[PDB]
Write an enzyme that holds these catalytic residues in place. Sequence first.
Site, PDB file in Angstrom:
ATOM      1  N   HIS A 177       0.850  -1.172   0.000  1.00 16.61           N
ATOM      2  CA  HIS A 177       0.000   0.000   0.000  1.00 16.61           C
ATOM      3  C   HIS A 177       0.907   1.252   0.000  1.00 16.61           C
ATOM      4  O   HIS A 177       1.445   1.647   1.052  1.00 16.61           O
ATOM      5  CB  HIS A 177      -0.949  -0.025   1.232  1.00 16.61           C
ATOM      6  CG  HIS A 177      -1.948   1.095   1.254  1.00 16.61           C
ATOM      7  ND1 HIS A 177      -2.762   1.356   2.343  1.00 16.61           N
ATOM      8  CD2 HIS A 177      -2.260   2.028   0.327  1.00 16.61           C
ATOM      9  CE1 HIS A 177      -3.515   2.414   2.091  1.00 16.61           C
ATOM     10  NE2 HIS A 177      -3.244   2.833   0.867  1.00 16.61           N
ATOM     11  N   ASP A 215      -2.590  -1.651  -3.492  1.00 24.21           N
ATOM     12  CA  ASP A 215      -3.163  -0.339  -3.620  1.00 24.21           C
ATOM     13  C   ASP A 215      -1.962   0.581  -3.977  1.00 24.21           C
ATOM     14  O   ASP A 215      -1.238   1.062  -3.085  1.00 24.21           O
ATOM     15  CB  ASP A 215      -3.868   0.091  -2.328  1.00 24.21           C
ATOM     16  CG  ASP A 215      -4.548   1.451  -2.455  1.00 24.21           C
ATOM     17  OD1 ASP A 215      -4.346   2.130  -3.475  1.00 24.21           O
ATOM     18  OD2 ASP A 215      -5.286   1.852  -1.541  1.00 24.21           O
TER      19      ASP A 215
END
Length: 324
Positions: A177, A215
């Site tokens: 992420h 992400d």
Amino acid sequence: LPPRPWITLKERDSASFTVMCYNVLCDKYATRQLYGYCPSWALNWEYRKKGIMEEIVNCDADIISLQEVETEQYFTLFLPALKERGYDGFFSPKSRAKIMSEQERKHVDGCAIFFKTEKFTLVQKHTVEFNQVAMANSDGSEAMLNRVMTKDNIGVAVVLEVHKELFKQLLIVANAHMHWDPEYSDVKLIQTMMFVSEVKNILEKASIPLVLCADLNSLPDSGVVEYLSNGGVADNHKDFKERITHGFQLKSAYENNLMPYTNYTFDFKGVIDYIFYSKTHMNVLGVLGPLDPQWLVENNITGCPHPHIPSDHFSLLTQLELHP
Ligand SMILES: Nc1ncnc2c1ncn2[C@@H]1O[C@H](COP(=O)(O)O)[C@@H](O)[C@H]1O
Ligand SMILES: Nc1ncnc2c1ncn2[C@@H]1O[C@H](COP(=O)(O)O)[C@@H](O)[C@H]1O
């Protein structure tokens, strides 16, 4: 809520398996200030967690990568519930080196990978802390230290043994992420490079197939996606604002616009989450396609979370086929 349609892309017959990638939206950032359009009772974690679990359970992926998993939620919810379903899991929070109370430490989020023990055996686990990798590689570069090293982001990776009866076979799953701020496309790019080269490496210590979930906080046109898709990028790519190459051959499970958005807020919608896989060893059989835009429109939903959508990201789910 109508069923999202399966989009089949290739036919079977090797070992098939599914991968889910899902940013769950941690409680700490689920506020009225950021999500003014969603009622408090629907933001509240007691409510939203049911929806998040239902999502994960019903996708029933063989491999699950989660982002924004709260530390205490990992131990008292995600892991015990998913063990009950046949999974084992690995989790690392961010800010491990940062000093904070016990209370704050329970609330810090991180990245988790889960996998069906019936189908995989965990061989190695690694945590990659981008702040620390940046600092060890700063090299009298002022941008690295001020801009990259000050960002608390992480990635995790597991080495798994694929049980031979699904056809000593190894698979690397990596989940990350990246930093979110669009004013920081340089950080995003550098965090991606550090993550990929730290993974190439894990790969040495233990030619081995790779699934990368993230992400990335990057659009498909970005320098980060360009870098992951094409095996490299130019050192003067504009995203560096202030040619670099890697060893893998990767494709996005959802390439060529199969979803219009993975993150869906009033102010912003676009594809920023990804599942990438090494094309030398694998094909995509299919993907879980988009939520029907008419349904969203008919229900007047222009931002998430919402009472029927427990996160501001949509899960990705892909079926892959692996060859030795
Ligand atoms: N038990 C603890 N261990 C480490 N740091 C702490 C502890 N308790 C308080 N602190 C410090 O105090 C700040 C605020 O604490 P609190 O009011 O408990 O959120 C934390 O961010 C830490 O800098
Ligand atoms: N590439 C991007 N361009 C513009 N805004 C972005 C981008 N990536 C992330 N964001 C912003 O950061 C949010 C994503 O935060 P996260 O939950 O960390 O993925 C999005 O909802 C946008 O507000």
